[PDB]
Amino acid sequence: SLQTSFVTLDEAIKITNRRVNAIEHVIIPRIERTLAYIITELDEREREEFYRLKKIQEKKKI
Amino acid sequence: QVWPVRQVRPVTEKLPANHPLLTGQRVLDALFPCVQGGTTAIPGAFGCGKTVISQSLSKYSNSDVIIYVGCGERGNEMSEVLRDFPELTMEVDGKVESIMKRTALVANTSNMPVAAREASIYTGITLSEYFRDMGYHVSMMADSTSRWAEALREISGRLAEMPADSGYPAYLGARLASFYERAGRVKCLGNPEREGSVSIVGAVSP
Amino acid sequence: QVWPVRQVRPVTEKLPANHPLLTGQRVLDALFPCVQGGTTAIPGAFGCGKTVISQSLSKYSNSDVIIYVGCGERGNEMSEVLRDFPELTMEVDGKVESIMKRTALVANTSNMPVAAREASIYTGITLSEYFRDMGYHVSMMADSTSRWAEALREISGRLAEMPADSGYPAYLGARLASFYERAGRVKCLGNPEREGSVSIVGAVSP
Amino acid sequence: VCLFLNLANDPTIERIITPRLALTTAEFLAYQCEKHVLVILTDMSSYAEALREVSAAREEVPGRRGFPGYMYTDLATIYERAGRVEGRNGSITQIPILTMPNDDITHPIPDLTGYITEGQIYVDRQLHNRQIYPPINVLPSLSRLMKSAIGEGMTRKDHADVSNQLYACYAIGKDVQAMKAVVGEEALTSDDLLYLEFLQKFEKNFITQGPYENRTVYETLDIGWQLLRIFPKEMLKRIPQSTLSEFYPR
């Protein structure tokens, strides 16, 4: 009984380890890079609108 | 002859495409070919060397004339084009002739002025139409029209115009559409009943 | 004598920093030493302990004067250094003495109009330079660096300037260069040929 | 050696002129004095910052990251003053080094600089974190004019094939390391271990050079063949057969 359970456990151990390693190596950096890209792009777009507002008030100076 | 560049030359009646364009590359021929009359794009970041594709297509084709327009590139590429194209030769009728006897080039390096970038592309397309009015098959090729768009952005910016998106003037999309429209097979205007076509391949620098 | 803030007092010549800035503890004094008259960054936040290095450089170091300059400071630090003057003494000749004599405190608390809050750093560096010209050694604690960038943003708020990055004025780099560079060891300008240096320690506050 | 130093004390607007002083002196020395010239332009990022400030003084139109829209044209004006000219003998070379904020290759400055230029070297942070000098990565490095620079008559016939296959093996090894970092030892194969051994030898010998040693080109090619010898000649896809016939048995 002891050795039967012991031979069975290893496959589950390997499955769990590969899943944890994948979650630590692939999924997280990708989403982090996307978060950086999205924040910088939104900042760019707010900036473009800001420049538009700046130039209209410049013309309104006349 | 003298011709206003902006105005599109007239024609008799457009015809459908019925024959492919020979491609010097294995890929994008058996998978995604371009017809003798179609329009194409070749965008991509730097490091790919789309100029390789441009030169390879220019060297090997079944067309009668070739026109290559450079806009905002390196001078090294034009040195390559001038030095190498003379040496290559092919023939169909006996004597072995150089391929620059069927090629015409327009030149604008990146250091050149700003609006000459527009002048080059418009001169090139007008020349392509004029040679199409001889009842020939002519291919055309571009180089980083995004530089042309950038030049228009700059000039319109100094004119104090509304930017539309990313700073680019609103009418650029319409300008690009009108530029790419003048192409495809067509029946020429003349009693001799000649017939020719134009193919265009355009490059973009995102 | 009176000296305008926005100019650098002259020096005969600038000598390379070739000596270590002593620190109280063997940690960060044998692993990663600093150089006398150099420029250094130290991360620091609330609760971590930032006055530990301040006091260490005030008591156990080879410098000669400490000028502590910050932004949005509290009376806690003011009274703490005031009481550390008679408590945290130094037995230079076996006798304790108030470290008030070896300090000249400068600080601004939120309230202060952003002009003065931004002028504090230049007042401090001017004072440090006036003291280094006397042939001594100095350590200028450029505390509250992130708050100082905030002060730069705040002064540019009333200028309608183009946001370089999240509101940073275009001349942010100019101000960084004009501040951090005025340091090092210099041969003084006079007959008896003194020598002295100013260090700057910009406490990073991410 | 002629210097045009620009200390940080100097006014910001002064930085616009200095590169053009260097380049016009270089052009004179290269097309009037008939001398080979080498140009080094340090910290183009500071020049970009100065250009941004001068442009913002007049409230001009931005592009990405608030930089001037005509920054591409300006950088082209700076860089395109290079090459060789007919009827002369001298030349001009440029090594326009720049700084790379936050290690982002999509930032406008390095992107436009790469567009105007024809290559890159990409000094690498992780190799410097392993304390190997010079820390040079080769995965992104590009010299587009190698096509005509190399070959017999300059160095040797099979230099190009050596470079191509060595690079192919390098890329395959990096992919193998990335794949091993996830799947585990049991999901590998012997070929992967051979590529890992190649990497071991490659980074630990070929890349590491030494500050003051002037290596020789043919020594580099001999070490290249040493590295290529490791694998069976059949796996060398990107080399033609005749090169293997001439050089593999050596």
From Swiss-Prot, chain A:
It is found in: Membrane; Cytoplasmic vesicle, Clathrin-coated vesicle membrane; Cytoplasm, Cytoskeleton, Microtubule organizing center, Centrosome; Cell projection, Cilium. It comes from the Eukaryota. V-ATPase is a heteromultimeric enzyme made up of two complexes: the ATP-hydrolytic V1 complex and the proton translocation V0 complex. The V1 complex consists of three catalytic AB heterodimers that form a heterohexamer, three peripheral stalks each consisting of EG heterodimers, one central rotor including subunits D and F, and the regulatory subunits C and H. The proton translocation complex V0 consists of the proton transport subunit a, a ring of proteolipid subunits c9c'', rotary subunit d, subunits e and f, and the accessory subunits ATP6AP1/Ac45 and ATP6AP2/PRR. Interacts with SNX10. Subunit of the V1 complex of vacuolar(H+)-ATPase (V-ATPase), a multisubunit enzyme composed of a peripheral complex (V1) that hydrolyzes ATP and a membrane integral complex (V0) that translocates protons. V-ATPase is responsible for acidifying and maintaining the pH of intracellular compartments and in some cell types, is targeted to the plasma membrane, where it is responsible for acidifying the extracellular environment. May play a role in cilium biogenesis through regulation of the transport and the localization of proteins to the cilium. Belongs to the V-ATPase D subunit family. This is V-type proton ATPase subunit D. The gene is Atp6v1d. The chain holds residues 150 to 211 of 247 of the full protein.
Swiss-Prot record, chains B, C:
The modification Phosphoserine is found at residue 178. Phosphorylation at Ser-178 by AMPK down-regulates its enzyme activity. It is found in: Cytoplasm; Cytoplasm, Cytosol; Cytoplasmic vesicle, Secretory vesicle; Cytoplasmic vesicle, Clathrin-coated vesicle membrane. ATP binds at residues 44-51. It comes from the Eukaryota. Belongs to the ATPase alpha/beta chains family. Catalytic subunit of the V1 complex of vacuolar(H+)-ATPase (V-ATPase), a multisubunit enzyme composed of a peripheral complex (V1) that hydrolyzes ATP and a membrane integral complex (V0) that translocates protons. V-ATPase is responsible for acidifying and maintaining the pH of intracellular compartments and in some cell types, is targeted to the plasma membrane, where it is responsible for acidifying the extracellular environment. V-ATPase is a heteromultimeric enzyme made up of two complexes: the ATP-hydrolytic V1 complex and the proton translocation V0 complex. The V1 complex consists of three catalytic AB heterodimers that form a heterohexamer, three peripheral stalks each consisting of EG heterodimers, one central rotor including subunits D and F, and the regulatory subunits C and H. The proton translocation complex V0 consists of the proton transport subunit a, a ring of proteolipid subunits c9c'', rotary subunit d, subunits e and f, and the accessory subunits ATP6AP1/Ac45 and ATP6AP2/PRR. This is V-type proton ATPase catalytic subunit A. The lineage of its organism: Eukaryota, Metazoa, Chordata, Craniata, Vertebrata. The gene is Atp6v1a.
From Swiss-Prot, chain D:
Kidney; found in early distal nephron, encompassing thick ascending limbs and distal convoluted tubules and in the alpha-intercalated cells of the cortical collecting ducts (at protein level). Expressed in epididymal clear cells (at protein level). Mainly expressed in the organ of Corti and spiral ganglion neurons, in both the early postnatal cochlea (P2) and the adult cochlea (P30). Disruption phenotype: Morpholino knockdown in the whole cochlea, especially in hair cells and spiral ganglion neurons causes a dose-dependent hearing loss. ATP binds at residue 144. It comes from the Eukaryota. It is found in: Apical cell membrane; Melanosome; Cytoplasm; Cytoplasmic vesicle, Secretory vesicle, Synaptic vesicle membrane. V-ATPase is a heteromultimeric enzyme made up of two complexes: the ATP-hydrolytic V1 complex and the proton translocation V0 complex. The V1 complex consists of three catalytic AB heterodimers that form a heterohexamer, three peripheral stalks each consisting of EG heterodimers, one central rotor including subunits D and F, and the regulatory subunits C and H. The proton translocation complex V0 consists of the proton transport subunit a, a ring of proteolipid subunits c9c'', rotary subunit d, subunits e and f, and the accessory subunits ATP6AP1/Ac45 and ATP6AP2/PRR. Belongs to the ATPase alpha/beta chains family. This is V-type proton ATPase subunit B, brain isoform. It comes from Mus musculus.
